[PDB]
Design a protein around this motif. Structure first.
Motif, short mmCIF file in Angstrom:
data_model
loop_
_atom_site.label_atom_id
_atom_site.label_comp_id
_atom_site.label_asym_id
_atom_site.label_seq_id
_atom_site.Cartn_x
_atom_site.Cartn_y
_atom_site.Cartn_z
N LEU A 27 42.02 36.73 46.63
CA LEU A 27 42.03 36.54 44.71
C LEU A 27 41.39 37.94 43.78
N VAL A 28 42.47 38.96 42.57
CA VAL A 28 41.98 39.37 41.59
C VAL A 28 43.29 39.54 40.84
N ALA A 29 42.22 39.79 40.27
CA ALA A 29 43.39 40.23 38.52
C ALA A 29 42.36 41.28 38.40
N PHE A 63 37.07 36.13 45.86
CA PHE A 63 36.90 36.22 44.88
C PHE A 63 36.14 37.05 44.12
N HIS A 117 46.64 30.27 37.04
CA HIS A 117 46.68 30.51 37.99
C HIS A 117 45.48 30.77 38.80
N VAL A 118 44.41 31.40 38.80
CA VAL A 118 43.71 31.06 39.56
C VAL A 118 43.07 29.51 39.62
N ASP A 134 46.10 33.59 33.26
CA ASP A 134 45.30 34.31 34.70
C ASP A 134 44.36 32.83 35.23
N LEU A 135 43.65 32.15 34.46
CA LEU A 135 42.73 31.08 34.79
C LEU A 135 43.48 30.24 35.01
N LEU A 147 32.77 26.44 39.73
CA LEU A 147 33.56 26.23 39.28
C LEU A 147 34.37 25.13 39.42
N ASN A 195 30.05 43.61 33.82
CA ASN A 195 29.73 42.06 34.80
C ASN A 195 30.57 41.38 34.34
N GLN A 196 31.48 41.73 33.13
CA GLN A 196 32.88 40.00 32.40
C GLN A 196 34.53 41.02 33.00
N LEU A 197 35.29 40.56 32.90
CA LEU A 197 36.78 40.74 32.52
C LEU A 197 37.03 41.26 31.23
N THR A 235 29.36 38.56 40.95
CA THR A 235 30.62 37.72 40.10
C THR A 235 30.16 36.29 39.68
N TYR A 264 35.50 43.00 47.30
CA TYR A 264 37.13 43.42 48.05
C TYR A 264 36.98 44.46 48.53
N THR A 320 46.85 39.63 40.51
CA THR A 320 47.18 39.65 38.71
C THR A 320 47.48 41.03 38.80
C1 U06 Z 1 39.56 34.50 36.35
C2 U06 Z 1 40.04 36.69 37.02
C3 U06 Z 1 40.28 36.16 37.56
N1 U06 Z 1 41.70 36.36 38.41
C4 U06 Z 1 41.98 36.52 39.49
N2 U06 Z 1 43.36 36.76 39.34
N3 U06 Z 1 41.17 36.46 40.64
C5 U06 Z 1 39.90 36.65 40.41
N4 U06 Z 1 39.09 36.71 41.39
C6 U06 Z 1 39.85 36.37 38.77
C7 U06 Z 1 37.82 36.20 38.53
C8 U06 Z 1 36.78 35.90 38.19
C9 U06 Z 1 35.20 35.80 38.00
C10 U06 Z 1 34.36 35.50 37.26
C11 U06 Z 1 35.65 34.27 36.35
C12 U06 Z 1 35.53 33.56 35.17
C13 U06 Z 1 36.34 32.12 35.36
C14 U06 Z 1 36.51 32.18 33.71
C15 U06 Z 1 36.68 30.79 33.84
C16 U06 Z 1 37.35 30.46 34.63
C17 U06 Z 1 38.62 29.15 34.50
O1 U06 Z 1 38.20 28.73 33.25
O2 U06 Z 1 39.23 28.73 35.89
C18 U06 Z 1 38.04 30.78 35.85
C19 U06 Z 1 36.79 31.97 36.56
C20 U06 Z 1 35.05 34.48 34.43
C21 U06 Z 1 34.09 35.18 34.81
C22 U06 Z 1 34.61 36.02 36.13
O3 U06 Z 1 33.60 37.22 36.22
C23 U06 Z 1 33.13 37.79 35.24
#
Ligand code: U06
Ligand code: NAP
Length: 157
Positions: free
Chosen positions: A5-7, A92, A30-31, A27-28, A54, A18-20, A46, A98, A111
């Motif tokens: 699972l990845v963007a 994740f 979607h996750v 996309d959040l 979560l 260390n952030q998106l 991560t 990965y 994504t």
């Molecule tokens: C949500 C971004 C994302 N998209 C997809 N398609 N696959 C993933 N694996 C991740 C990811 C990730 C890690 C991550 C998630 C989050 C995060 C924030 C909010 C929510 C939520 O509101 O559900 C989920 C994950 C924040 C920071 C972070 O790394 C810095």
């Protein structure tokens, strides 16, 4: 089932400091929909960036730290531990996980963020000659989601 699972962006950037690198609520969501009720496996960095597990799913963190013990989080200390996890397991991130898992997973939920961001961490190169496109759906853009994006489900051929 073992899934990635990845963007990632057009150049496979997945992270910066260390952030998106992008702000993309859809996309959040979607996750959240894919992983709720199942299992997320993530590397230690991560996990620390998220800061807390979560809600409404099993959170598993891979680390060499024998002192790691966080409430609401299960710890594993080896890649091979992943294979003992029951149910639908989503790999994740981040980059290390990965790289370690891309040749082992059944499928990938990707994504594609249709832009070029500054990054310091990357999804590994992959070829569509190895992966069938089970589905490809354009993300809808709005006031809160302004970067074009595509949801791919790829299944190993
Ligand atoms: C949500 C971004 C994302 N998209 C997809 N398609 N696959 C993933 N694996 C991740 C990811 C990730 C890690 C991550 C998630 C989050 C995060 C924030 C909010 C929510 C939520 O509101 O559900 C989920 C994950 C924040 C920071 C972070 O790394 C810095
Ligand atoms: N765009 C996305 O979908 C997405 C998703 C997730 C993450 N990210 C991004 O990814 C970046 C982080 O990636 P990263 O590679 O720096 O870190 P990471 O993969 O999240 O964590 C690396 C850590 O995981 C642990 N680890 C990995 N393999 C291990 C193994 N085989 N045995 C024991 N421990 C192991 C180690 O922890 P210890 O050092 O504690 O031993 C290692 O230092 C961040 O920028 C984050 O935002 C993006």
């Amino acid at each position: 089932t073992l899934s990635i699972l990845v963007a990632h962006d057009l150049q496979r950037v997945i992270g910066f400091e260390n952030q998106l690198p992008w702000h993309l609520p859809n996309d959040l969501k979607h996750v959240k929909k894919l992983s709720t009720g199942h299992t997320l496996v993530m590397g230690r960095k991560t996990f620390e960036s998220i800061g807390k597990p979560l809600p409404n799913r099993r959170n598993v963190v891979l680390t060499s730290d024998t002192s790691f013990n966080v409430e609401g989080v299960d710890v594993i200390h080896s890649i091979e531990d992943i294979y003992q996890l029951p149910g639908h397991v989503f790999i994740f991130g981040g980059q290390t996980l990965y790289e370690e898992m891309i040749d082992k997973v059944d499928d990938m939920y990707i994504t594609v963020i249709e832009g070029k961001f500054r990054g310091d961490t990357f999804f590994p190169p992959y070829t569509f000659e190895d992966w069938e496109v089970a589905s490809s759906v354009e993300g809808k853009l709005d006031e809160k989601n302004t970067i074009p994006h595509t949801f791919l489900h790829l299944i190993r051929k």
